[PDB]
């Protein structure tokens, strides 16, 4: 029976069958999640560019890296940003299904330097649930903060 879990650790050390990179539309290495991700799967960045609100899979050997591009809320209106964030997660669910994986390691898109300086834990996590609820995969959400870990865990436990 597929589950949602949260882990406070480096997504580059995930124990899942594939990883979602919080990517930029240029397909460039970047910093944060994208940094450790670039260092662990650099060959996954070959032709990894995909537009805001989309996801693109690049294989690193047989290990799929799903480059998902959340909106930078600095650049987007709240309404248009929300739509692009929902869309990015929809494309992640499609890739996860197409790959036939049993599990996926995923960050909360648009919650760091793309957040526009605002707390988007609930906004981002709800878009993640909406997309991934139609999939068969175990989902492991990776965060770095302790508080965020607690809140994500509570939101997971609240649905069951
Ligand atoms: O803020 C983020 O977590 C984030 N979400 C994303 O979808 N893409 C990003 C690309 C570069 C840096 C940060 C990000």
Q: How does DSSP assign 128-139, residue by residue?
A: HHHHHTTS-SEE
Question: Rounded to whole angstroms, how far apart are CA atoms 103 and 106?
Answer: 10
Q: At what angle do helices 146-159 and 121-132 cross, to 10 degrees?
A: 40
According to DSSP, the β-strands at 63-68 and 55-60 are antiparallel
User: Which resolution, in Å, applies to this structure?
Assistant: 1.8
Residue pair 79/66 in contact by the 8 Å Cβ criterion: no
85: which residues sit within 8 A by CB, 6+ positions away? 53, 70, 71, 109, 110, 120, 123, 124, 127
Q: Is 50 in the pocket of ligand 1 (CB under 6 A)?
A: no
DSSP of the chain, one letter per residue? ---EEEEES-GGG--SS-EEEE--TT----STHHHHHHHH-GGGGTT----TT-EEEEEETTEEEEEE----TTTS-HHHHHHHHHHHHHHHHHHHHHHT-SEEEEE-TTSSTTSTTS--HHHHHHHHHHHHTTS-SEEEEEES-HHHHHHHHHHHHHH-
- Cβ(135)–Cβ(11) under 8 Å? no
Packing angle, helices 121-132 and 78-99, rounded to 10: 40
Atom of ligand 1 nearest to the CA of 69: 7
* CB environment 83-110: b (16+ within 10 A), e (fewer): ebbbbbbbbbbbbbeebebebbbbbbbb
Please state the three-class secondary structure of 137-157 as a single string.
CEEEEEECCHHHHHHHHHHHH
C-beta separation of 15 from 5 below 8 A? no
Cα maximum dimension of the chain: 40
- d(CA 131, CA 12) in angstroms, rounded, equals 23
Q: Is 29 exposed, middle or buried (0-12, 13-18, 19+ CB in 10 A)?
A: middle
Mutate to test the pocket of ligand 1, among 48, 70, 89 (most ligand atoms within 8 A of CB): 70
Tell me how many domains the chain contains.
1
Domain extent at residue 105: 1-160
Beta bridge partners of 57: 66
Rounded to the nearest whole angstrom, what is the distance from the C-alpha of residue 70 to the centroid of ligand 1? 6
In the reported structure, the alpha carbon of residue 8 is separated from the centroid of ligand 1 by a whole-number distance in angstroms of 17
Assess whether the C-beta atom of 57 lies below 6 angstroms from ligand 1. Answer: no
34 ligand 1 Cβ < 6 A: yes
Structural tokens at position 39: 């260092």
* Separation between Cα atoms, residue 11 and residue 106, nearest integer Å: 8
Method: X-ray
Cβ atoms 128, 108 nearer than 8 A: yes
CB-based contact 96:135 (threshold 8 Å): yes
């Amino acid at each position: 029976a597929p589950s949602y879990r949260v882990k406070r650790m480096d997504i580059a050390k995930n124990d899942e069958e594939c990883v979602v990179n919080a990517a930029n539309p240029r397909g460039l290495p970047g910093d944060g999640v994208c940094k450790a991700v670039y260092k662990k799967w650099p060959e996954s960045f070959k032709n990894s560019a995909t537009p805001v609100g989309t996801a693109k899979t690049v294989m690193c050997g047989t290990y799929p890296v799903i480059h998902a591009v959340g909106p930078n809320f600095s650049n987007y209106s709240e309404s248009e940003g929300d739509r692009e964030l929902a869309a990015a997660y929809r494309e992640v669910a499609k890739e996860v299904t197409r790959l036939g994986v049993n599990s996926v390691a995923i960050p909360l898109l648009s919650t760091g330097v793309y957040s526009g300086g605002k707390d988007r834990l609930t906004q981002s996590l709800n878009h993640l649930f909406t997309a991934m609820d139609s999939t068969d995969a175990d989902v492991v959400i990776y965060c770095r903060d302790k508080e965020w870990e607690k809140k994500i865990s509570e939101a997971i436990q609240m649905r069951t």
